Amino acid sequence: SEEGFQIPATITERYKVGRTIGDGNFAVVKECVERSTAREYALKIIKKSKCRGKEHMIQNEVSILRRVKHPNIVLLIEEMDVPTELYLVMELVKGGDLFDAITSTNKYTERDASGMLYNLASAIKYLHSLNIVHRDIKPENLLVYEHQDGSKSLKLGDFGLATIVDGPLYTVCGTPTYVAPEIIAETGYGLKVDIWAAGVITYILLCGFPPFRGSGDDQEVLFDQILMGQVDFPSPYWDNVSDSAKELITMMLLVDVDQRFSAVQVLEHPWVN
Amino acid sequence: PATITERYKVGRTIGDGNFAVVKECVERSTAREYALKIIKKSKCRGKEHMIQNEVSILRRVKHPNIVLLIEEMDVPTELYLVMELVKGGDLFDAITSTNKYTERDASGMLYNLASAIKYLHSLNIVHRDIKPENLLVYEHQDGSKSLKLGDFGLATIVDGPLYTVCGTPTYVAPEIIAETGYGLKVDIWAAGVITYILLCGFPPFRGSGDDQEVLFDQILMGQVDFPSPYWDNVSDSAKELITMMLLVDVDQRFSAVQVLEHPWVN
Ligand SMILES: N#CC[C@H](C1CCCC1)n1cc(-c2ncnc3[nH]ccc23)cn1
Ligand SMILES: N#CC[C@H](C1CCCC1)n1cc(-c2ncnc3[nH]ccc23)cn1
């Protein structure tokens, strides 16, 4: 391949591997056609070795992907473990990621925004029912599934940081823009860090900028805003948005974790029907 | 950055890796030698941004067998960590230069590592990446040598079973592979694997290039061999301790305290 992975003959036999559609650290995603059926799939190639000497490391993503199926979550079709790399065959999603879509159309209507939150809150409710926290919910990790109808669903991917919650966690991880206060505070966190992330994304969908923005002074500013957690809906940007939307986003972006909506409560809110 | 260039004369790279470089630096005012760790956060040739966990832990820990954090300068591009300098290189390099060590030198090194671990476990911190590459050789004036635990990238506070599958296969505990819940004692298993390598020069659980599942099944069953002629010289004491460190039963497996109370490290 372009990057220089030695593609196993087992893979090349079954699949024709196409162009790269997703790039990360120690992982690439490619288009690929199954030779028998002519059906299009996503091939995710994960490097186990760091390629920094023989610094062989272990992957956690596939433990999670095996035990989950949902319309609004990326689907693992099968896996090929090779000494060098882990190869995941997954359902292909052709509409790109939510980050790309937001940069293309600054804002979204409440109708389009609620539909996307309905999809994301559905994925999160399912994961949470299995005590799985994602810990990396962000636009770059939400894939746009385009229906023939013209309608668009979101599919959640990148379960790299996903784990099972059996009591409070303390690992400091995620993207600062989307990270919950209790992660920064290091007082312990669980499933509801995902609700916070979803609240931040919903806010961005409606106005085109995040609720907590850093400064050129320092990065401690962004973290100070998140810890304070005062959500503002400034004019003129939020003038023509409903109170209902503002209410829901508020309930998702509460520092008090017991008061912060669960995924069930988001889904029961009138703004998502 | 200017602010760092002012205080510190940054010398050569002494440690390299993914998203991180460690360089020798000297504080100009005091002529004091330090290690400068530069952690790039973006690492995506783009606007992508990620948070750093190592620093939360380093702030909490002070121990003679743990690398000491002196100060942190958070520039928007990268994070800078000034840390205690250890000039003796990593234990991996040390093992590759000296095939195997005497029992006395090995028990010495396990004393240092079990001391670090005991300290961390008393603060409910699991390290989760204990391996030769992450152990630094402190060279005393006497010419005696200590170990210092270096990288806390995967380190966290434990309040109930963890499930995240992480670490290096050679040193990974069976409960991590089994996905049944793990805690502090994954560090004891790692320490057992290292002790075994120190005495014979090879790991107790060895993989087939053809099948790495042979490695994991060995780990899962705790199939520890003490083969001849390699282990002919080594005492029953060393073999018995390693045995208690590499037990699959987490409840039976030695704590850091129990390792330290073992005659072989006394
Ligand atoms: N989500 C997310 C981020 C992820 C990148 C990060 C690591 C590999 C690429 N990614 C997955 C895809 C992707 N695109 C299209 N179909 C897909 N199916 C499964 C993953 C996938 C693209 N980027
Ligand atoms: N331990 C460990 C692994 C780590 C590497 C992995 C991330 C940066 C380099 N590393 C730290 C050092 C090091 N060497 C000498 N003095 C030091 N002080 C603090 C870290 C350090 C060398 N490699």
Alpha carbon of residue A11 to chain centroid? 27
User: Same domain, yes or no, for A33 and A118?
Assistant: no
Q: Are B74 and A218 in contact (CB under 8 A)?
A: yes
Domain boundary residue, one of A69, A92, A115: A92
3-state secondary structure chain B: CHHHHHHEEEEEEEEECCCEEEEEEEECCCCEEEEEEEEECCCCCCCCCCCCCHHHHHCCCCCCCECCEEEEEECCCEEEEEEECCCCCEHHHHHHHCCCCCHHHHHHHHHHHHHHHHHHHHCCEECCCCCHHHEEEEECCCCCEEEEECCCCCCEECCCCECCCCCCHHHCCHHHHHCCCECCCHHHHHHHHHHHHHHHCCCCCCCCCCCCHHHHHHHHHCCCCCCCCCCCCCCHHHHHHHHHHCCCCCCCCCCHHHHHCCCCCC
Query: Of A62, A86, A169, A196, which to mutate for an interface test with B (greatest number of B Cβ within 10 Å)?
Result: A169
User: Same domain, yes or no, for B137 and B226?
Assistant: yes
Among the atoms of ligand 2, which is closest to the Cα of residue B81? 19
User: Same domain, yes or no, for B201 and B232?
Assistant: yes
User: Same domain, yes or no, for B100 and B231?
Assistant: yes
Residues facing B182 on adjacent strands? B162
Neighbours of B41 (CB within 10 A): 19
B91: left (phi over 0), alpha (psi -120 to 50) or beta: alpha
> Cα(A272)–Cα(B16) distance, rounded to whole angstroms?
49
Number of domains in chain B: 2
- Report the nearest-CA residue for atom 22 of ligand 1: A22
User: Same domain, yes or no, for A253 and A148?
Assistant: yes
Q: How far is the CA of A249 from the centre of ligand 1 (A)?
A: 27
User: Same domain, yes or no, for A104 and A69?
Assistant: no
Alpha-helix residue ranges (DSSP H) falling in A79-166: 98-104, 110-129
Domain boundary residue, one of A41, A76, A92: A92
Which residues, 6+ apart, have CB-to-CB distance to B228 below 8 Å?
none
The experimental resolution of this structure, in angstroms, equals 2.1
Q: Chain B within 8 Å of A171 (Cβ-Cβ)?
A: yes
* Strand, helix or coil for residue A187: coil
Please name the amino acid found at residue A148.
Q
> Cα(B185)–Cα(B166) distance, rounded to whole angstroms?
15
User: Same domain, yes or no, for B121 and B194?
Assistant: yes
Domain boundary residue, one of B85, B116, B146: B85
CA angle A201, A207, A210 (to 5 degrees): 45
User: Same domain, yes or no, for B94 and B36?
Assistant: no
> Cα(B171)–Cα(B180) distance, rounded to whole angstroms?
17
> Cα(A242)–Cα(B255) distance, rounded to whole angstroms?
58
State phi, psi for A150 to the nearest 5 degrees: 105, -25
Q: Are A213 and A163 in contact (CB under 8 A)?
A: no
Helix axes B236-245, B103-122, angle to 10 degrees: 30
* Strand, helix or coil for residue A144: strand
User: Same domain, yes or no, for B11 and B94?
Assistant: no
Q: Which range of residues forms the domain containing residue B2?
A: 1-85
Enter the tokens of residue A247: 């209410």
Give which of A107, A139, A126, A106 is closest to A264, Cα–Cα: A126
Query: Of B58, B165, B179, which to mutate for an interface test with A (greatest number of A Cβ within 10 Å)?
Result: B165
Neighbours of B3 (CB within 10 A): 10
Q: Which of B129, B187, B236, B251 is catalytic?
A: B129
- In order of A194, A197, A248, B105, B254, the CA distances from A125 in angstroms are 10, 14, 16, 54, 40
User: Same domain, yes or no, for B186 and B60?
Assistant: no
E strands in chain A: 15-23, 27-34, 40-47, 76-81, 85-91, 132-133, 142-146, 152-156, 163-164
Q: How far is the CA of A29 from the centre of ligand 1 (A)?
A: 6
Ligand 1, pocket-test mutation among A65, A143, A178, most atoms within 8 A of CB:
A143
User: Same domain, yes or no, for A120 and A215?
Assistant: yes
Enter the tokens of residue B145: 């040598």
> Cα(A140)–Cα(A177) distance, rounded to whole angstroms?
12
Residues near ligand 1 (Cβ within 6 A):
A 21-24, 27, 29, 42, 44, 74, 90-93, 140-141, 143, 157-158
